Amino acid sequence: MLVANINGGFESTPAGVVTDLAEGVEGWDLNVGSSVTNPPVFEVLETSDAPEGNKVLAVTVNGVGNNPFNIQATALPVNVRPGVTYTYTIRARAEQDGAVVSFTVGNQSLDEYGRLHHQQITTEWQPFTFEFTVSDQETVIRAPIHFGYAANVGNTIYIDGLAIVDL
Ligand SMILES: [Ca+2]
């Protein structure tokens, strides 16, 4: 497959808790804001139930902050061409009932090209997909996933299989 993003299924990353948020996971930048005073636990899990390869990224939400983007996992770099329309697909599920996530894509100056807003994540693996167009002249963009919703407290959200493909 020809994908714009890197390590979209976490296959290159050793299983275990992610402590180096910025650089511990190839193709991704994880971030926790200072208003989250009880930090989440990001963990790459080897699991037979992984939709893609052997591994998934698990995010356990303990505290939350002031905005849902205060807990995020961002795919970057994402290599694209100006004017092209892309399909974004990712798989997600949660440990408990009631999880919410927003899947977004935008540029390095923080202009957003598109998102799936407040998606209802269930206890079963489901695909979440949308289209977006690179409407400016950027070639290296980013794909921020927001997890810091109050509804997620106590929950673990699992993601796998990010693929951003020419449409
Ligand atoms: Ca995987």
Side-chain angles (χ1 to χ4, degrees), residues 9-10 50 53 55-56 160:
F10 308 102
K55 288 174 282 193
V56 307
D160 194 13

Side-chain angles (χ1 to χ4, degrees), residues 25-51 53-151:
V25 184
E26 185 187 40
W28 296 79
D29 194 298
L30 282 27
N31 181 277
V32 180
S34 70
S35 298
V36 186
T37 54
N38 186 9
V41 181
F42 289 96
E43 177 188 307
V44 166
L45 276 165
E46 205 145 352
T47 193
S48 235
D49 192 42
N54 295 317
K55 288 174 282 193
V56 307
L57 180 64
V59 187
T60 300
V61 178
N62 293 306
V64 293
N66 299 129
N67 286 286
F69 55 74
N70 295 157
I71 301 172
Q72 82 174 11
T74 298
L76 77 82
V78 178
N79 288 97
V80 297
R81 306 181 286 123
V84 177
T85 305
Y86 294 86
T87 299
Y88 177 117
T89 308
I90 198 173
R91 319 272 153 174
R93 68 170 204 96
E95 195 63 28
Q96 310 288 334
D97 285 338
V100 180
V101 172
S102 305
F103 303 102
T104 84
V105 65
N107 65 25
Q108 292 183 65
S109 299
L110 306 190
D111 302 311
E112 189 171 284
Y113 301 117
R115 66 163 60 199
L116 284 176
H117 188 62
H118 289 50
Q119 299 296 285
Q120 309 291 302
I121 310 306
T122 73
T123 55
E124 298 171 355
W125 286 110
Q126 298 183 280
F128 296 86
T129 184
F130 72 101
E131 298 178 359
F132 68 93
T133 303
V134 174
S135 58
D136 55 14
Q137 294 297 315
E138 296 303 298
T139 54
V140 179
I141 66 165
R142 61 206 284 283
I145 303 173
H146 302 163
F147 295 97
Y149 293 92

